[PDB]
Amino acid sequence: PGPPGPPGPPGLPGLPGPPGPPGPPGPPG
Amino acid sequence: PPGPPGPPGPPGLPGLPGPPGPPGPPGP
Amino acid sequence: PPGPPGPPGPPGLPGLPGPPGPPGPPGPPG
């Protein structure tokens, strides 16, 4: 037949990353 | 004539880890 | 005579960054 068609659409964006690291300990008591 | 378009591509990479959390509560 | 389908698209964009982490632990005792 003729040549292959064009590439498909780009994929969807990736999942979001995981939560960030825990924050620092709070101020002294 | 040319073939149909291909299917959609794979999902992108997972995103980066989030920002650090805020400081914790005051201590005892 | 339509030829074969094209290849799969390229991979998507990188995802968004995650949310902020949790609050830190409570501070040192006095």
Coil, helix or strand at residue C29 = coil
Whole-angstrom distance, CA of residue A10 vs CA of residue B9: 5
Cβ atoms C16, A13 nearer than 8 A: yes
The separation between the first and the last C-alpha atoms of chain A, rounded to the nearest angstrom, is 79
Whole-angstrom distance, CA of residue C20 vs CA of residue B18: 5
Contacts of C6 in chain A (CB under 8 A): 4-8
Residue that is written with structure tokens 């949310």 in the block: C19
Q: What is the resolution of this structure in A?
A: 1.4
Cβ atoms A20, B20 nearer than 8 A: yes
* Number of Cβ pairs < 8 A linking chain B and chain C: 94
Closest CB to B5: pick one of A8, A15, A25: A8
The verdict on a CB contact (< 8 Å) between B27 and C22 is no
CB atoms within 10 A of CB C29: 8
Count of residues in chain B? 28
| Residue C27: closest C-alpha in chain A | A26
